[PDB]
Amino acid sequence: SDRVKKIESFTLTLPRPNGRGYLVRKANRTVYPTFDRSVLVRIETENGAVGWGETYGLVAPRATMEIIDDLLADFTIGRDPFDAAAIHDDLYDLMRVRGYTGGFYVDALAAIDIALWDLAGKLAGLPVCKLLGGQRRDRIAAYISGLPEDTRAKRAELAAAWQAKGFSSFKFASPVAKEMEILRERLGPAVRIACDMHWAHTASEAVALIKAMEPHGLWFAEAPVRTEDIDGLARVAASVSTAIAVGEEWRTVHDMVPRVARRALAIVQPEMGHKGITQFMRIGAYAHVHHIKVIPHATIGAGIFLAASLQASAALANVDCHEFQHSIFEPNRRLLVGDMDCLNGEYVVPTGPGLGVEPSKEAQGLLKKH
Amino acid sequence: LSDRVKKIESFTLTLPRETPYLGKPRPGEEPNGRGYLVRKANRTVYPTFDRSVLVRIETENGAVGWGETYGLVAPRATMEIIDDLLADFTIGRDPFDAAAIHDDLYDLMRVRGYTGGFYVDALAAIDIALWDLAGKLAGLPVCKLLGGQRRDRIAAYISGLPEDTRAKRAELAAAWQAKGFSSFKFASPVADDGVAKEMEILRERLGPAVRIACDMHWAHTASEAVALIKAMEPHGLWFAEAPVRTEDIDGLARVAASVSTAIAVGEEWRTVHDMVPRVARRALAIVQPEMGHKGITQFMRIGAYAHVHHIKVIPHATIGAGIFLAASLQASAALANVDCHEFQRRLLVGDMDCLNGEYVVPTGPGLGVEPSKEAQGLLKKH
Amino acid sequence: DRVKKIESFTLTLPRETPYLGKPRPGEEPNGRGYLVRKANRTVYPTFDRSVLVRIETENGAVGWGETYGLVAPRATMEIIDDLLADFTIGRDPFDAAAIHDDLYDLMRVRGYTGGFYVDALAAIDIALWDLAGKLAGLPVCKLLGGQRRDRIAAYISGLPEDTRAKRAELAAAWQAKGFSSFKFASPVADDGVAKEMEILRERLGPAVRIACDMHWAHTASEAVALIKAMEPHGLWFAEAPVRTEDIDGLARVAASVSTAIAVGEEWRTVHDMVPRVARRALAIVQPEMGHKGITQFMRIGAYAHVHHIKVIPHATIGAGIFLAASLQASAALANVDCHEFQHSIFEPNRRLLVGDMDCLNGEYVVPTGPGLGVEPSKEAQGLLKKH
Amino acid sequence: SDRVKKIESFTLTLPRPNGRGYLVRKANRTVYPTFDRSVLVRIETENGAVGWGETYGLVAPRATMEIIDDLLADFTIGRDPFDAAAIHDDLYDLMRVRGYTGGFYVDALAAIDIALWDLAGKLAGLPVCKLLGGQRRDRIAAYISGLPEDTRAKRAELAAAWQAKGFSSFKFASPVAKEMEILRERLGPAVRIACDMHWAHTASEAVALIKAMEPHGLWFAEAPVRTEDIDGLARVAASVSTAIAVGEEWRTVHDMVPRVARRALAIVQPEMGHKGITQFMRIGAYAHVHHIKVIPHATIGAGIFLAASLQASAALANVDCHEFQHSIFEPNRRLLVGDMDCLNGEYVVPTGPGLGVEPSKEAQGLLKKH
């Protein structure tokens, strides 16, 4: 029965618009870094076992690390990794009554949670999914996310290149019915194609856009309206055949309850980097009870939370497919040791104990301690 | 090694005669030729001796897991479901896949409407042994596999209050209060002078400290249940258990919306699917899962659904060998929102106990309990 | 004049081709002859089997009942022999429905209100009703309110052939035999249900009715897409489009398509029905007599009447006894539009039965009483294995 | 037309249980500092006008300051203070789609917002409330919040001492029907008394507790159940006469919409330190349309956001009363210059332009820059 001894948080800052390297895209008005960055967490136990965790580090990563280093670490040191979920709950209860129930606070918890589960797995010599109810899958279907090219012609080509590599599921970021046609045209009628609509529409607009895409067989519509527009979302889902998909920006199972109450989604798209295993599973288990499909999100990252996501996805009954960030996943290979792969439209669930991946010895060299 | 399930066996085990929940059986309630009798108070069938079904699962290496479900009525049926169907689908699988195994076993028969009753009784016994195994294989208590150990003690409350008069029922209650109990539940069928007089004599006898709940035992319309609840509230009512019939979901929702008291249901359910419609109608404040009907997987799912919807968990308890009791305590030690646990020894080894109004969670790997060598000799094989 | 003796039996007949078609690669039977079908994760036997109950009164009248026995039939018989029999002996068959309730009340508070337990009730119930008809010299439908009908429209269910075109041809054969309503199972639609409707509509013409049984394993979104893909071809009804437990999903599917939504075969009591009609979730109920028994079957029919819902009874694997109950009860119900007809089961099973039940020219001929009007033949009784 | 030139954030750490000075109270399981700390913001314009802002700094204050210094400052420099509300919106839109819609993120925005409004006022030579639609009040009723004494007898005395000072409205923190009786007993039947129930109850428990207090004339019940238990809240409000009060832990008007939809509150209790003027007003304006009373929260602070709160409260039609943190407000006097006072059960709305208060020259000496 080994216990948490030490907790360090880091950034990893890889290169790929204002002074500090921040730009703001103008169809969601959202800020972006012009480089890749995530926050990593290393947790060592008394007997020298090491767990790794990760969360977003795109903007103000020193905030998240502070929360970890100023508050969370002290209430986590001395605890048992096998109480990972109970620990996540106590740490959540620390700040919930002051409205710290999402954003950077839950990010900080995600990173910690993931490493406790990593550590749990290594310590029991099992991959996490075998601590999460069982392994249901060795592989998980993957879909191609975002064609980041200058014109639609140049984007269809890129689609068809990934089709030529054994991928038969695709998402394009709308920010509209033409883009859909050429993608159906170039890719044939067996491939499934989803549209990410990036939040910036009223229910009315989203419905007209969705209805103009349905004649080409729209797989799902993601984020048709703003997060807070629960009414618009429900109105959108009751007005179209097409499955509506949301969840990437949530933090806990509580975020989901209102949306299933209003029967406003067919698909949850949880993002592990934002949630951590405990909450991820809680979202997947809720969706299970309510016959909602799970299609986890993927994003810029070192690949730790990603690995954490595949382990959980392997445990969840309702996981149909998983997002594949090619432009992220490809260059970020060198930074990891382990059997995590994606090829021929399928992620390979890692097998080693824990997450089954670790940052390489050289990736650890690139870390900047907080 | 990757130790897989090699063998599954089913047994019945006859249990020591207790004082039954409702007495003290009246005349005109004699067992028929086959051993079964019917209570007038609930038109419900009861065996002459209490009895449960036990399942023993051995892995390839020789690791042993125990599970247990109800064996009160037609236990051969439940055992046939295991021996004929489920066994051959469990063999070869990994105990660490117990919850996925359960989903697959459930999926075999669900479209034909075998979604509760005897079928889940059968899955529950299997599920519990599988989790026992996972525990032992990993050398960890079950709660350490379910998210962590939140407590090592679970508050208990007294359920058995069977005597002739109110005076004797009160005396009995007080006898348990001196043994360390501060929570009680009485059954309204036993309340011969009305539920109100039952409450009055208990409140004064036990003081304003103790909390006192009522198992209303299903046989009421909503309207009747509300009237009886309101007539109890004055005397400080903890909760009202099973105020209406199970199928009566509107009735339940209506009772819940008409009284301040906490409405508690859950013991006769089988899976988390049974809970959804009740909370969608805001019709309960307390779930009372019964481990012997549900198994660790479903019980945890009911527990986690209750967490999301701010419902308290107060597990049911029934006569048994102690295997599903141990499972229930392991699961209760993991659940955030388990308030307390129902309570109503010579058969198991392990450090499970109930004293001073508290359950003691067993410490070993797995469930923390095993049948003794002697008890193993009492098992009648199917 | 009271019930004196109650015996339970299995009847096991071997199959040339396992139900619903030949297994796909990873669908081989196990040690005991149990395969698992991937499309619906459901377990099937390779042989046909069912449980039959024979009930005898003090004066020597005999009633027959029958329930499912596909899987673990000794469980159902155990319930009947260990518990139910001794609470049924001594009662009057004319109290069939009251008896059904008495026996149901025996176990309800422990949650045994479905599955195998009601299976056991269903079989006793049918034999009880059978007795009542025999004792009174009446067909069962003349104790259930009246005979409204002596023919019932039948529809061809299941088309066991390897290719789309071979299945269409099978349809066409039964069309020539006088049937004009059809249902195909989606676990069989290799090229996808859309192409299946296309060809069936092509092969059979514009006038014929064609439904799709979707076998549960779908989310609402999924089911809506599939239905809408089939609708240009003229869809009669969608059966089991989502999970039984998925009441919200069913409601949303019902609301999202003009196509009639059909459910009911896996329920056990009228109680299962309430939530689904409350949510406006079905146009059609499909009770399966072998799971429900006459009493419950009529409660469900009466509810559909009250709530303006069509009744199209389910038909399945079995000797014909509980199917004969199905025809009797359908005969007494206002809302019965039609009744499923498993040709591939009914035809080879004729040998097992006496009586004048028939199904020909797109019509079930309702047996002319007394009781069920059908019974196991002397040869079928020789094959019965007692529990 | 002067514009934002420079933005600095600070902590102020006053003295009044683990190593770093954090304890966790066990009826809400919440973490607390054993000292008073808030985060202050100073914003100077091109022509040297100074605005002051403040937000929570109780836990991990360097996180909040980071968010301000790493992201917010750059998108705020060069803007016009008179666009304060529009600026708050653009800054909110920067991070909303990643789930940064509450907690530390909105705190950081509150602090900035408040100073933009301060600056707006000074720059127009008007107190803020005269930029917010008009002044409706010179004074705002105040109620005594929390009797922090060892026994109920010792707490009733303290109540009656504040009654002897012209205060006729009181709140006690439950963490129960006896405490209510002695407070009614000692204080007489004219005084109004509310109970803060600190979130940790199910609907069932909250109703029984409220019903046991109503026989002594309960003014309101605050936070009867957890924030996420919107159902429990609605059930509680439909089961008791007593007005139910919530809102202190919210962040934007969006938090409130679900609760008014379910008709789950009679009173909003916005906390300015958490929200900032823009959102505060939005909450007060929503409540206005829906006939909900506004009773703003008060808390440990230097008194900047407090002053900001009184300015907004002066502008809102539905402000019945305001919370008075005596144990905080009293010692924190020395740190401010301006005409902000509370006496005889009434706050005095400040009159100078802007917030009408500023940290003293010596308080500025105690600031630690980030």
Q: What is the DSSP letter of A126?
A: S
Q: Which of A265, A291, A294 to mutate to test the interface with C (most CBs of C within 10 A)?
A: A291
Say if residues B141 and B366 touch (Cβ distance below 8 Å).
yes
Say if residues B163 and B186 touch (Cβ distance below 8 Å).
no
* Host H or E run for residue D111: helix D103-124
Residue D365: is it exposed, middle or buried by C-beta count within 10 angstroms (0-12/13-18/19+)? exposed
Residue-wise over B334-348: b if at least 16 C-beta within 10 A, else e? bbbbbbbbbbbeebb
Cβ neighbours of residue C82 closer than 8 Å, sequence gap 6 or more? B34, B73, B74, B76, B77
Say if residues D287 and D268 touch (Cβ distance below 8 Å).
yes
Q: Round to whole Å and give the CA distance between B264 and B242.
A: 6
Task: State phi, psi for B343 to the nearest 5 degrees.
Answer: -140, 140
- Write down the residue that tokens 């199959």 correspond to: C15
Nearest to C326, CA basis, from C102, C144, C105, C194: C144
Residue D85: is it exposed, middle or buried by C-beta count within 10 angstroms (0-12/13-18/19+)? middle
Tally Cβ neighbours within 10 Å of residue B253.
20
Q: Round to whole Å and give the CA distance between B354 and B344.
A: 10
Six-digit token pair at C14? Answer: 């071997």
Q: What is the DSSP letter of C23?
A: P
Range B254-257 contact pairs with CB under 8 angstroms and sequence separation of 24 or more: B254/B222, B254/B226, B255/B222, B255/B225, B255/B226, B255/B229, B255/B283, B256/B282, B256/B283, B256/B284, B256/B285, B257/B282
User: What distance in Å separates residue B14's CA from the closest CA in chain A?
Assistant: 33
Q: Name which of D103, D249, D250 is nearest A103 (Cβ-Cβ).
A: D103
Residues written for chain C: 387
Residue D202 to residue B312, Cβ atoms within 8 A:
yes
Identity at A254, one-letter amino acid code: H
Residue B81 to residue C75, Cβ atoms within 8 A:
yes
Say if residues A98 and D29 touch (Cβ distance below 8 Å).
no
Residue C219 to residue A290, Cβ atoms within 8 A:
no
Nearest to C316, CA basis, from C343, C283, C282, C356: C343
B261 CB neighbours in chain D (<8 A) are: 204, 208
User: What distance in Å separates residue B325's CA from the closest CA in chain D?
Assistant: 27
Residue-wise over A270-291: b if at least 16 C-beta within 10 A, else e? bbbbbbbbbbbbbbbbbbbbbb
Chains contacting A (3 or more CB pairs within 8 Å): B, C, D
Angle, to 10 degrees, between the axis of helix D272-289 and the axis of helix D103-124?
80
Q: Round to whole Å and give the CA distance between D295 and C330.
A: 66
Say if residues D141 and D322 touch (Cβ distance below 8 Å).
yes
Bridge-partner residues for B47, per DSSP? B36
Q: Name which of B261, B282, B312 is nearest D231 (Cβ-Cβ).
A: B282
Residue C371 Cα distances to A100, C4, C124, C329, angstroms: 71, 18, 14, 11
Q: Round to whole Å and give the CA distance between A275 and A284.
A: 12
Say if residues D39 and D9 touch (Cβ distance below 8 Å).
yes
Question: By what method was this entry solved?
Answer: X-ray
Same fold? B1-148+363-382, B149-362: no
Q: Round to whole Å and give the CA distance between B280 and B282.
A: 6
SS3 C374: strand
Q: Which of residues 78-137 of A touch C (CB under 8 A)?
A: none
Q: Which of A1, A80, A131, A138 to mutate to test the interface with B (most CBs of B within 10 A)?
A: A131
Range C93-96 contact pairs with CB under 8 angstroms and sequence separation of 24 or more: C93/C3, C93/C55, C93/C57, C93/C63, C93/C128, C93/C129, C93/C131, C93/C132, C93/C135, C94/C132, C94/C135, C96/C125, C96/C128, C96/C129, C96/C132, C96/C294, C96/C295
Which numeric CATH code is attached to C147-367?
3.20.20.120
Tally Cβ neighbours within 10 Å of residue C262.
26
Q: What is the fold of B1-148+363-382?
A: Enolase-like; domain 1 (3.30.390)
Q: Round to whole Å and give the CA distance between C164 and B181.
A: 70
Q: What pairing do the DSSP bridges indicate for beta strands D22-25 and D192-196?
A: unpaired
Q: Which of residues 206-265 of A touch D (CB under 8 A)?
A: 223, 226-228, 230, 249-251, 254, 257-258
Cβ neighbours of residue C98 closer than 8 Å, sequence gap 6 or more? none
Six-digit token pair at D23? Answer: 């304890």
Chains contacting D (3 or more CB pairs within 8 Å): A, B
A96 CB neighbours in chain D (<8 A) are: 30, 226-227
Question: Do chains D and C touch by CB distance (3+ pairs < 8 Å)?
Answer: no
SS3 D359: strand
Residue D70 to residue A93, Cβ atoms within 8 A:
no
Residue C115 to residue B119, Cβ atoms within 8 A:
yes
The DSSP code sequence of C218-257 is --HHHHHHHHHHHGGG---EEES-S-TT-HHHHHHHHHH-
Q: Round to whole Å and give the CA distance between C214 and C216.
A: 6
Six-digit token pair at C327? Answer: 């025809």
D149 in contact with B at a CB cutoff of 8 Å? no
Nearest to A269, CA basis, from A292, A240, A239: A292
Q: Round to whole Å and give the CA distance between D227 and B223.
A: 33
Say if residues C241 and C218 touch (Cβ distance below 8 Å).
yes
Residue B282 to residue D207, Cβ atoms within 8 A:
no
Residue C23 Cα distances to B104, C39, C72, angstroms: 19, 11, 21
Residue B152: is it exposed, middle or buried by C-beta count within 10 angstroms (0-12/13-18/19+)? middle
The domain covering C1-146+368-387 belongs, at the CATH homologous superfamily level, to: Enolase-like, N-terminal domain (3.30.390.10)
Nearest to B266, CA basis, from B248, B280, B284, B239: B284
Residue C268 to residue B113, Cβ atoms within 8 A:
yes
Six-digit token pair at B129? Answer: 């042994």
Q: Round to whole Å and give the CA distance between A142 and A155.
A: 19
Cβ neighbours of residue C95 closer than 8 Å, sequence gap 6 or more? none
For chain B, which residues make up each domain, given as ranges?
A: 1-148+363-382, 149-362
Six-digit token pair at C340? Answer: 């499923």
Alpha-helical runs (H) found in A125-269:
152-163, 177-187, 203-213, 230-237, 253-261
* Sign, Cα dihedral of B183, B188, B191, B193: positive
Tally Cβ neighbours within 10 Å of residue A174.
21
User: What distance in Å separates residue D203's CA from the closest CA in chain B?
Assistant: 8
Q: Which of D104, D249, D251, D282 to mutate to test the interface with A (most CBs of A within 10 A)?
A: D104
Angle, to 10 degrees, between the axis of helix D203-213 and the axis of helix D177-187?
30
The domain covering B149-362 belongs, at the CATH homologous superfamily level, to: Enolase-like C-terminal domain (3.20.20.120)
A20 CB neighbours in chain D (<8 A) are: 70, 74
Residue D70 Cα distances to D7, D40, D56, D94, D230, angstroms: 11, 16, 18, 13, 35
Nearest to D277, CA basis, from D152, D128, D149: D128
Q: Round to whole Å and give the CA distance between B167 and B192.
A: 12
Preceding amide of C370 cis, omega within 30: yes
Q: Name which of C31, C70, C114 is nearest B116 (Cβ-Cβ).
A: C114
Residue C43 to residue B108, Cβ atoms within 8 A:
yes
* Sign, Cα dihedral of A305, A306, A310, A315: positive
Nearest to C93, CA basis, from C50, C51, C52, C64: C64
Q: Round to whole Å and give the CA distance between C22 and A320.
A: 27
The domain covering A135-350 belongs, at the CATH homologous superfamily level, to: Enolase-like C-terminal domain (3.20.20.120)
Six-digit token pair at A300? Answer: 């810029």
Residue A134 to residue B94, Cβ atoms within 8 A:
yes
Task: State phi, psi for C6 to the nearest 5 degrees.
Answer: -135, 115
User: What distance in Å separates residue B187's CA from the closest CA in chain A?
Assistant: 33
Q: What is the DSSP letter of C84?
A: I
Q: Round to whole Å and give the CA distance between C260 and C338.
A: 14
Opening angle at CA B301, ends B299 and B304, nearest 5: 110
- Write down the residue that tokens 């299903």 correspond to: B218
Q: Round to whole Å and give the CA distance between C344 and C362.
A: 15
Strand boundaries in A322-364, DSSP class E: 322-324, 336-338, 341-343, 346-348, 357-359
User: What distance in Å separates residue B16's CA from the closest CA in chain D?
Assistant: 39
Nearest to B183, CA basis, from B226, B229, B237, B231: B237
A282 CB neighbours in chain B (<8 A) are: 304, 308
Nearest to C76, CA basis, from C57, C56, C55, C53: C53
- Tell me the CA end-to-end span of chain C in Å, nearest whole number: 26
- CA neighbours closer than 13 Å in the CB half-sphere of residue B97: 20
Say if residues D46 and D3 touch (Cβ distance below 8 Å).
yes
Cβ neighbours of residue B340 closer than 8 Å, sequence gap 6 or more? B154, B155, B156, B157, B183, B314
Q: Which of D204, D233, D235, D262 to mutate to test the interface with B (most CBs of B within 10 A)?
A: D204
Say if residues C131 and C371 touch (Cβ distance below 8 Å).
yes
Residue B158 Cα distances to A285, B249, B314, B354, B355, angstroms: 33, 28, 12, 11, 12
User: What distance in Å separates residue A243's CA from the closest CA in chain C?
Assistant: 5
A190 in contact with C at a CB cutoff of 8 Å? no
Q: Round to whole Å and give the CA distance between C193 and C212.
A: 8
D28 CB neighbours in chain A (<8 A) are: 93, 97
**CB-defined contacts B:C, below 8 A:** 150
Alpha-helical runs (H) found in A248-332:
253-261, 272-289, 304-315, 326-329
Say if residues A9 and A111 touch (Cβ distance below 8 Å).
yes
Say if residues D337 and D360 touch (Cβ distance below 8 Å).
yes
Q: List the resolution, Å.
A: 2.5
Q: Name which of A67, A99, A228 is nearest D60 (Cβ-Cβ).
A: A67
Q: Round to whole Å and give the CA distance between D253 and D88.
A: 13
Residue-wise over D218-245: b if at least 16 C-beta within 10 A, else e? bbbbbbbbbbbbbbbbbbbbebbebbbb
Is C265 part of any known ligand binding site? Answer: yes
Q: What is the 3-state secondary structure (H, E, C) of chain B?
A: CCCCEEEEEEEEEEECCCCCCCCCCCCCCCCCCCCEEEECCCCEEEECCEEEEEEEEEECCCCEEEEEEECCCCHHHHHHHHHHHHHHHHCCCCHHHHHHHHHHHHHCCHHHCCCCHHHHHHHHHHHHHHHHHHHHHHCCEHHHHCCCCCCCEEEEEECCCCCCCHHHHHHHHHHHHCCCCCEEEEEHHHCCCHHHHHHHHHHHHHCCCCEEEEECCCCCCHHHHHHHHHCCHHHCEEEEECCCCCCCHHHHHHHHHHCCCEEEECCCCCCHHHCHHHHHCCCCCEECCCHHHHHHHHHHHHHHHHHHCCCEECCCCCCCCCHHHHHHHHHHCCCCCECCEEECCCCEECCCEEECCEEECCCCCECCCEECHHHHCCCEEC
Say if residues B204 and B179 touch (Cβ distance below 8 Å).
no
User: What distance in Å separates residue A242's CA from the closest CA in chain C?
Assistant: 7
C228 CB neighbours in chain A (<8 A) are: 241
Alpha-helical runs (H) found in C106-246:
115-136, 164-176, 193-204, 220-230
Six-digit token pair at C257? Answer: 């398509």
B264 CB neighbours in chain D (<8 A) are: none
SS3 C377: coil
Torsion of Cα atoms, A96 then A100 then A103 then A107, to 10°: -60
Q: Round to whole Å and give the CA distance between D259 and B133.
A: 47
User: What distance in Å separates residue D250's CA from the closest CA in chain A?
Assistant: 6
Bridge-partner residues for D105, per DSSP? none
Nearest to C54, CA basis, from C9, C120, C99: C9
Q: Name which of D31, D105, D227 is nearest A103 (Cβ-Cβ).
A: D105
Residue D204 to residue B309, Cβ atoms within 8 A:
no
Is B267 part of any known ligand binding site? Answer: yes
Say if residues C283 and C261 touch (Cβ distance below 8 Å).
yes
Identity at D83, one-letter amino acid code: D
B144 CB neighbours in chain A (<8 A) are: 80, 82-83
Task: State phi, psi for C237 to the nearest 5 degrees.
Answer: -155, 150
Chains contacting B (3 or more CB pairs within 8 Å): A, C, D
How much is the CA Rg of chain C, to the nearest whole Å? 20
Is D46 part of any known ligand binding site? Answer: no
Q: Round to whole Å and give the CA distance between D368 and D12.
A: 7
B270 in contact with C at a CB cutoff of 8 Å? yes
In chain C, whose CA is at the least distance from the CA of B248? C271
User: What distance in Å separates residue C254's CA from the closest CA in chain A?
Assistant: 12
Q: What is the fold of A1-134+351-370?
A: Enolase-like; domain 1 (3.30.390)
Q: What is the DSSP letter of C337?
A: -
* Sign, Cα dihedral of A63, A69, A75, A79: positive
Nearest to D59, CA basis, from C32, C127, C29, A66: A66
Q: What is the DSSP letter of D300?
A: S
Q: Name which of A22, A67, A250 is nearest D63 (Cβ-Cβ).
A: A67
- Tell me the CA end-to-end span of chain B in Å, nearest whole number: 31
